[PDB]
Ligand binder design. Sequence first.
Ligand SMILES: [Mg+2]
Lengths: 317, 196, 111, 130, 49, 34
Amino acid sequence: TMPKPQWHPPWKLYRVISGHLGWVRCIAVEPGNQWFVTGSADRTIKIWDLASGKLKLSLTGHISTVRGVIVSTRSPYLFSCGEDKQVKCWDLEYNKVIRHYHGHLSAVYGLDLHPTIDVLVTCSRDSTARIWDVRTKASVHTLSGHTNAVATVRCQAAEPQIITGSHDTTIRLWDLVAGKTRVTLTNHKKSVRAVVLHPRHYTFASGSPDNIKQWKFPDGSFIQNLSGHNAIINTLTVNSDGVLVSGADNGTMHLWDWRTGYNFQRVHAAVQPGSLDSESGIFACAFDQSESRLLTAEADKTIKVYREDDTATEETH
Amino acid sequence: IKGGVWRNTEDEILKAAVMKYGKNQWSRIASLLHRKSAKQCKARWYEWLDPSIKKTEWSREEEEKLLHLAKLMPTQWRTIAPIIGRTAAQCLEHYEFLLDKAAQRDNEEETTDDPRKLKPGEIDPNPETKPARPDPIDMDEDELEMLSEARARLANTQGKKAKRKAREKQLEEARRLAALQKRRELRAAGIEIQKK
Amino acid sequence: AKTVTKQRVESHFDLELRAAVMHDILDMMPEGIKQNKARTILQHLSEAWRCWKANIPWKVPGLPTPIENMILRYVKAKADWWTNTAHYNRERIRRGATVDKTVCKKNLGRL
Amino acid sequence: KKKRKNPDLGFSDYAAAQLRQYHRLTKQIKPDMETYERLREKHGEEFFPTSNSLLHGTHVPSTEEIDRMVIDLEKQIEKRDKYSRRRPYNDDADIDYINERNAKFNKKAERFYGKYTAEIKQNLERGTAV
Amino acid sequence: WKIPPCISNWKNAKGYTIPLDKRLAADGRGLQTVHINENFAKLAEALYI
Amino acid sequence: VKNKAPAEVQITAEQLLREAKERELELLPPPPQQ
Ligand SMILES: [Mg+2]
């Protein structure tokens, strides 16, 4: 035992929200904890009340599965992307689409907003990531260099400003200004389907079905290797208390210590009554802005909501 | 002007056509057998040619379950038949045979009560439930032409575009050898005509 | 970059379904697999969809249970898309909304 | 007198067959001590190099070495080309194919589904019964 | 992890000829097992009485 | 004069398959020795 891990209280499901008619493929929380978006394969975007778990709005307009949804923090906007090939801005003042971002040759798998510049970045199946200006709806750069479908992308304000993993088992750390790759990290053996950024410690994590890896930001140094959750993992999310969540395609979800890399809880949730045993699966997970609720978008067309158990230490390895 | 009695030749072409086209394309099979429609081919398959149709002798527990189900579901042979594992026509025929072997023993001796109630001068309503006529020695133009079309359609796999491209490849090879001979003669005698 | 408008919709859906299945079987096979055999699993998925539409019970005698479970998952997803499209177009045909003639024939055939 | 048995198991990997093939080639080779001691006495201190000594861009092999390498590699190509031996083609079996690829696809079907579809073939050969 | 081939009841794209046991190898429609209830008996006997 | 009589051969499906294999309506001839 080289490290001693911080004790984290275990999590438990307390709310199963239902009402989508397709796999819930994305989730995102508003900056004020008043509501949260989901996007699903029933071609809609649903505003849910975060306190009561009640459907606040349903927004139609996609032609195919909704893959990524994000709410802007600087502007009152709602960006969404789909297998439609369509990337959209929803003006939440009007609940209508005002701008559509055109140029993806195939399906769009994820999107992220730059926190300070008003620049949208998108992943696509055509092996590219695109860089869009919000105001002028134009492609600034086309990040090319992956060879397979691009699965996940993130953004910083500090250095390398765009980090994306893809299905070619590589991860490229980029230059937003030039539009060229700075670091190609090839350590994974299977496809990287989730990258995630730590809020404080200036490191990041990346997940693939072999194992999950933690990495320094300036040039990508190896730091650690978090293993044991060996399924096809779809999302990773980080809590500022150092809780890491890994949700997989087989419904299994592990809870992890960020610092020491310790597995303190395994959660294998159950499917909805009508659903099937082969249909347990997690496509997205997100913490709220209070970082005390865990919202998981499941493959049984549900939203499951978790919170911490208030009972003291029955734990520590 | 379709149907009639099934011969062995039509049934073997039907077997080979199920081997080629499957059990979900009956109008492609019935194009291979004239004077037989797609419903007739489908019925003949499921009633005399499926190798799950038990053409063996009825056992004891089979006819016990037969009498139990026929007393249990009156005149419902399409429902009784998948339970006892026989064709509904065979199931009905053997049930009528078992009722004959009790009514004849209970009342009569051999005859006397109405000699014939069979079917003269008519076309049988279900000829797919009946075994196949053998093939006559002198097969006519219809049967031999049907066998020839059967072999010629069991051989083919290619469509229009593949067949025109194969002929186009042969024509390209022929015109290449012809231009080769012309150019070889022009270089052999020696005439330096250039081309475009 | 052509848009999926109205006559590309089913072809784009069935284009993306194949791609999602391809990514899942590239992630699902273990480390020492020959990395062939994708086309056969795609044919098993198409046959499983045909057997769902025909209401034929679909079982392959020898098949690995991750491939069989994944095919059942994606066949249930295409079933949901098919059925919700049928409900939507039936409500449109009932109210008298602007519908194509081909969507009337397709909707009758689904119902 | 010596005796050694080396059969093959299943395939399972592209590296295990490489390792078997390497052990075969590396047991077949014979070193020449004259050339070895000659190059050792010529090279001296650097004949036991590290990862990073100097000699990477220096060696020029004479004609006999490259001829031995080419002959060995031709033998290795021949041994690789003898990998898939053709099974003898009998025409007494009732053929169930109309093409050249149909026969091999029916062979693959008999490989995979041949263990499960063992009753129905008996039903066919006994006259579509049972 | 071996994947057997797909012998389809609909598509035969290269026009092959497949043996019947391989062709009708749909196990699920053979294990459907048409099984009856026991309350048919009470109904039929009560109607005859 | 045509005679109806039960035969002895009784042609089957595998005979049709064997006689259909030898039609060779798709095998293109090899190119000539040039
Ligand atoms: Mg045609």
